[PDB]
Amino acid sequence: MQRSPVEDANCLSRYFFWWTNPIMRKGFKEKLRPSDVYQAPSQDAADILAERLEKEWDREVASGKKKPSLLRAMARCYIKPFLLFGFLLYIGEATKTVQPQLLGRIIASFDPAHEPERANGYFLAFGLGLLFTARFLLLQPAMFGLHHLGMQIRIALFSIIYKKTLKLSSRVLDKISTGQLVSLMSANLGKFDQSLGMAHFIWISPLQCILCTGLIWELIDVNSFCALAAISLLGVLQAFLSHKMGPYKAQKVLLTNKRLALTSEIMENLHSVKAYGWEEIMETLIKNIRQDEVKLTRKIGSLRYFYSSAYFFSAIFVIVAAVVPHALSRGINLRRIFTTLSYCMVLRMTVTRQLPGSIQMWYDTMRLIWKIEEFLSKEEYKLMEYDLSITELELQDVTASWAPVLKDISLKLKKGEMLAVTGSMGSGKSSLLMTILGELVPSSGKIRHSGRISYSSQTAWIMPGTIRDNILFGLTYDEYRYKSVVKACQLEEDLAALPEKDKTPMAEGGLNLSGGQKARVALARAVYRDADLYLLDAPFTHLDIATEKEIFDKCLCKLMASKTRILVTNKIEHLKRADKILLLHNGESFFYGTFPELQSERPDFSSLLLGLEAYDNISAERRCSILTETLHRVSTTKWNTYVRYVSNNKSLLYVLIFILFIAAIEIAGSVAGIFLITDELWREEHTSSYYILYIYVATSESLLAMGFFRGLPFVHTTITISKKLHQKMLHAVLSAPMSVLNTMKTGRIMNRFTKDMATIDDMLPLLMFDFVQLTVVVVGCILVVSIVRPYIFLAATPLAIIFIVMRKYFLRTGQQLKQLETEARSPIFSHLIMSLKGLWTIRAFERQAYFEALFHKTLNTHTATWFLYLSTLRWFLFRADILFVFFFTLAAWIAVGTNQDKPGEIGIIICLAMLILGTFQWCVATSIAVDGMMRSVDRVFKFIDLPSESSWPHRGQIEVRNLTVKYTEAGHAVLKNLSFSAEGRQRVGILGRTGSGKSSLFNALLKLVYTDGEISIDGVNWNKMPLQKWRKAFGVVPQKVFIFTGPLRMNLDPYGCHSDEELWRVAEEVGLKTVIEQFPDKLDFQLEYGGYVLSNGHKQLICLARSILSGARILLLDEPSAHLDPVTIKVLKKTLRQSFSTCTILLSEHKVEPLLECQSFLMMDKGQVKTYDSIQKLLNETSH
Ligand SMILES: CCCCCCCCCC
Ligand SMILES: CCCCCCCCCC
């Protein structure tokens, strides 16, 4: 669409990345959008990437022998780029070995004997810088290349699995699990692609290690093996911790679910939780189960410190133990040490840093490739063989299995004729169609149908978009057909009713349009479609006496009756209309024919089936069950967000005060040592003396590293902040007003607790320690180098000031550019999940290519987004790395050319600078990862900032005059100036418009929306009684009652100050004792999963009890009739009378039978009220 600039790029511009400049600019000025970002390169296109690998895999399957392997397939054409970069990494890393030798010459140039050699001093230091630059230029493009290759791989690899998953055998589909299919492709996107770049190291590290170890001198002195053994013992020490981690993870991962599932319960039914008015027990209950999670997290975190720390303390341990044996014999020499130190730390890093990460990958990627290899071996859908036009379908003793599901069906169906089939709920209801379609395979028999076959399924689904797109669905628009079909489908009302008419957008499911309208548009496909055979499967789920006979009489008889039809339904009129009928019995045939023939077969069945007089008006589920019975019967980051994070725990400030002090002391001592010691070292030869300290001065990483007394409290003080910061959120969301809380719709609140809270709790505290640690090493190093050579400050100050500005520049565009990846990620799954549910239908209209094509475009958007980001980072790293060699070369070039006669201080300056490069890249690398994570905590603060909020003298009257709500929506019957004169201790009823916001009137009194007018308790305003004291009054018992996981003791009594006799005596008076007697442990029995296993009717009684436990003034009723029945209604009626006779009741009911019971009934419309006691005055308005 937008046309990408890399297409029209120059070899230099593409190498250094000149093309990002405008997109770098834009993002700094104005915020970016999906329309602004532009497409991927023509090379990187999913059609081109997949189609190649298809051919090369096809070759492996074509040569049909042994067992094809995708690794061997991909190898047929992915090596040419892989081995091209392969050398670049090796030659790019091999330059590191040369650096020691050139350092040694500078130590060889300078000593108290002989004059200070200038020429070599300068030109060899510069000559080092040449190699030092050369390392980057060769490594950078290769490193960036492998990411491009890794990205290029999986783009094909999702296409090749998707091609298969659209067409498999249907039997195996209900063997294979849903989570395995999704999670396999969900896990790979971010991790796999980035991970591929370090695979090469598997042979790089050994090839260097063997060369380095051999290149180390003192081969006669068997101590380089001891120096290797020092690296071995480090590996043992680390691995020992990895075993001790696992036991604690299993304890945490089990616990973390308990709160996460419970939060999902409590948050969804919040309206009740507030209506009862708890907010005290729900805190402490969560806090109690949190305790173990905090203890275990702390116990893990403190352990993990040593795993990171050991690497820092290693350098001094390995370096000393390597050299001090050589101290015994062979006197002492300075150029001997420095070279052997430099060679050590290369091998120390390359064995511990990346060698694990290389091996780590090949275990994963191969284990994953195994899963694809298994998956592609799975059995396939047999392609349709309808391509004939001899004669229509005729079967003969056909058997099938999923006790065979079908056993010897026989029907010689003649063309252009009508047919109907039905039976029990099972008994081969939906299966017989699948064999005609070709979804299920016939076990034995002869089935053969000519010409193309249409289909309409049981459960309908809607492709997201236009209505005509669903209806016409890969056809061309025409005059009459569409009109007559849409007219015949009973959508003439829905034609006029909708605003955009045919262009109305639809998505998600059945929220926008109703299940009835879904069932219409479902049928529209097959009715609009042209075919040789028509197959419907239970299209009349709805109980429409008009619609059923309208569409059956008008559409079929007039339009479709010339052509053949099969239908599954339960209507005697349709059965009597049909030419041929068929009845089943669990795979074996009951009978097929017509009622006149049936009268000469089973006259008792003929009569007793017909016995129901008013059969057409019976409910679908009812009459189906009657048939079932009778048949079987008969037969932007900010500076503040850090300040807030530190401001919680003061201990995080009080820990930082003395960890700064140690840096100044340990700097000062090294400055003193470098200045004071050196002269005596040279003077020693011309004893041990002070060489061993002079080693420790050089190892700046291991010098300023943090131990247990100095650094451990940092872990303790940080984790406490995540505990506190949790409380502030949970309390703030729980205690908040229902207005701004109502817009979000719980697809976002849980998301914070699931993902965002876990990353602040788990991944942050540890990750911060690196950022604190590494900065101290680099800052503390440079200053020691600075103090000795004053003019370094002028070299340092511009580069630092540049370096921060670069980061501010990259982050503003980058953070905005990155989120578009995570947004663009979501379509790819949504498109997969939806495609599975219509797998039967999507084949029937041969519409695979359309979806297979549509699938690519959702990838191409994502890969374009990703590719731009990934490069932008590569730029920043490259510019930042080059900016170091300036610092090195300037410092080095000036150092030797100083106003100082004594050059022995150079030996430190150059050596102690060279080692930082490894830490420098590593330090800036985390610097993005921290700053990105800091955006996540900011979301929690936004939630924390969200706004927030005795006796009755034997009385319980209510008459709230002048009540006006301020929600402005209540079923087109909003409360304005409301009033009623109902006496206390009287049962009351209520009515209004059919759909007048029946709920809103209740929660207006409970105060879950904005309200006006005074509301007095018999002359006692809320003035005295706050929101809790008010909510003590009303007894609520809604259609969706609230039960949570735990025992009935905890459900009935949250606070826990009621006696056992008190708990029983209320229960038996409510009428819920003998029903409970059957359960064990009195009332201590546990309930789970919302208490679904228990009975429906008693699930009200438990809440009705809860009110007697709670308080006595007023009760409410939100239409319980749907959850009521003859035996329950009478006890519910009588026990209520015996129980209360004090508190008022309000009952909203659309039915007439509830009107006979109560005293008075309101007939309420917007600004209109009326009610009377006596039946002549009461009923007259609502008589009809
Ligand atoms: C596409 C391959 C380009 C590699 C450039 C290497 C430059 C080496 C200069 C020392
Ligand atoms: C928000 C402050 C970030 C400080 C980064 C310091 C980097 C210094 C590199 C020499």
Which ligand gives the minimal distance to the CA of 804?
Answer: 2
CA-CA distance, 423 to 623, in Å (whole number)? 11
The three-class DSSP label of residue 85 is helix
CA-CA distance, 643 to 335, in Å (whole number)? 49
Which regions of 473-572 does DSSP assign to beta strands (E)?
A: 505-506, 534-535, 565-567
For tokens 């030109």, name the residue.
123
The reply to whether 993 sits in an annotated binding site is yes
Q: List % helix, strand, coil for the chain (3-state, nearest 5).
A: 60, 5, 35
CA-CA distance, 866 to 820, in Å (whole number)? 8
Render 181-229 in DSSP notation, one character per residue.
Answer: HHHHHHHHHHHHHHHGGGTTHHHHHHHHHHHHHHHSS-SSSTTHHHHHH
Burial annotation 862-879 (CB, 10 A radius, 16+ → b, else e)? bbbbbbbbbbbbbbbbbe
The pair phi, psi for residue 1118, each rounded to 5°, is -105, 65
The residues, any chain, with a CB within 8 Å of residue 879's CB and separated by 6 or more, are: 806
CATH 3.40.50.300, the chain: domain bounds: 398-612, 987-1043+1091-1179
Report CA(15)–ligand 1 centroid distance (Å): 9
- If phi > 0 it is left, if psi is from -120 to 50 it is alpha, else beta; for residue 962 that is left
Report CA(804)–ligand 1 centroid distance (Å): 29
The reply to whether 423 sits in an annotated binding site is yes
CA-CA distance, 990 to 980, in Å (whole number)? 11
CA-CA distance, 1148 to 49, in Å (whole number)? 64
Report CA(800)–ligand 2 centroid distance (Å): 9
Would you say the CB of residue 145 lies under 6 angstroms from ligand 1?
A: no
CA-CA distance, 156 to 386, in Å (whole number)? 33
Would you say the CB of residue 137 lies under 6 angstroms from ligand 1?
A: yes
CATH of domain 398-612: 3.40.50.300
The three-class DSSP label of residue 319 is helix
The residues, any chain, with a CB within 8 Å of residue 274's CB and separated by 6 or more, are: 738, 1008, 1031
- If phi > 0 it is left, if psi is from -120 to 50 it is alpha, else beta; for residue 612 that is beta
Beta bridge partners of 1144: 1114
Question: Would strands 1144-1148 and 1114-1117 be described as parallel, antiparallel, or unpaired?
Answer: parallel
Would you say the CB of residue 81 lies under 6 angstroms from ligand 1?
A: no
Report CA(81)–ligand 1 centroid distance (Å): 14
For residue 442, which of 482, 490, 393 has the smallest C-alpha distance? 393
Q: Please, what sign has the CA dihedral across residues 429, 433, 439, 442?
A: positive
Residue 238 in tokens: 């680390």
DSSP state at residue 1121: G
Report CA(283)–ligand 2 centroid distance (Å): 40
Would you say the CB of residue 778 lies under 6 angstroms from ligand 2?
A: yes
Report CA(242)–ligand 2 centroid distance (Å): 32
Give me the half-sphere count of Cα atoms (radius 13 Å) on the Cβ side of residue 4. 17
- Closest ligand 2 atom number to CA of residue 782: 10
The reply to whether 599 sits in an annotated binding site is no
The angle, 0 to 180 degrees and rounded to 10, between the axes of the packed helices 334-352 and 355-376 is 20
Q: How many CB atoms lie within 10 A of CB 51?
A: 13
Beta bridge partners of 400: 406
CA-CA distance, 1123 to 324, in Å (whole number)? 87
DSSP state at residue 419: E
The angle, 0 to 180 degrees and rounded to 10, between the axes of the packed helices 691-698 and 651-676 is 130
The three-class DSSP label of residue 594 is coil
For tokens 């008994």, name the residue.
427
Which ligand gives the minimal distance to the CA of 144?
Answer: 1
Which amino acid belongs to residue 846? Answer: E
Would you say the CB of residue 138 lies under 6 angstroms from ligand 1?
A: yes
Beta bridge partners of 591: 583
Report yes or no: 892 and 913 within 8 Å, Cβ to Cβ: yes
The reply to whether 402 sits in an annotated binding site is yes
Burial annotation 694-720 (CB, 10 A radius, 16+ → b, else e)? bbbbbbbbbbbbbeeeebbbbbbbbbb
- Please measure the distance between the N-terminal and C-terminal CA atoms of the chain and give it in whole angstroms: 64
Query: Considering only CA atoms, which residue is closest to atom 1 of ligand 1?
Result: 141
CA-CA distance, 978 to 139, in Å (whole number)? 78
The pair phi, psi for residue 743, each rounded to 5°, is -75, -35
Burial annotation 178-188 (CB, 10 A radius, 16+ → b, else e)? eeebeeebeeb
Report CA(705)–ligand 2 centroid distance (Å): 19
CA-CA distance, 794 to 797, in Å (whole number)? 6
Q: How many CB atoms lie within 10 A of CB 1039?
A: 12
The reply to whether 425 sits in an annotated binding site is yes
- Closest ligand 1 atom number to CA of residue 84: 2
- Closest ligand 1 atom number to CA of residue 145: 1
The three-class DSSP label of residue 882 is helix
CA angle 333, 338, 339 (to 5 degrees): 105
Name which CATH class applies to 987-1043+1091-1179: alpha beta
| Radius of gyration, CA atoms only, the chain | 40
The reply to whether 366 sits in an annotated binding site is no
Residue 881 in tokens: 């790395």
The reply to whether 427 sits in an annotated binding site is yes
* Resolution of the PDB structure in angstroms: 3.7
CA-CA distance, 557 to 573, in Å (whole number)? 14
Report yes or no: 341 and 319 within 8 Å, Cβ to Cβ: yes
Q: How many CB atoms lie within 10 A of CB 946?
A: 14
Strand order of the β-sheet with 418-422 is 534-535, 565-567, 418-422, 580-585, 588-593
Which ligand gives the minimal distance to the CA of 142?
Answer: 1
The residues, any chain, with a CB within 8 Å of residue 1150's CB and separated by 6 or more, are: 991, 994, 1119
Which amino acid belongs to residue 20? Answer: T
Report yes or no: 1170 and 1162 within 8 Å, Cβ to Cβ: yes
Name the experiment that determined this structure. cryo-EM
Query: Considering only CA atoms, which residue is closest to atom 4 of ligand 2?
Result: 804
Report CA(88)–ligand 1 centroid distance (Å): 9
CA-CA distance, 578 to 601, in Å (whole number)? 18
Give me the half-sphere count of Cα atoms (radius 13 Å) on the Cβ side of residue 882. 12
Which ligand gives the minimal distance to the CA of 803?
Answer: 2
CA-CA distance, 794 to 783, in Å (whole number)? 13
The residues, any chain, with a CB within 8 Å of residue 327's CB and separated by 6 or more, are: 688, 691
Report yes or no: 227 and 322 within 8 Å, Cβ to Cβ: yes
Render 597-659 in DSSP notation, one character per residue.
Answer: HHHTT-HHHHHHHHT-SS-TTS-HHHHHHHHHHHHHHH----SHHHHHHHHS-SHHHHHHHHH
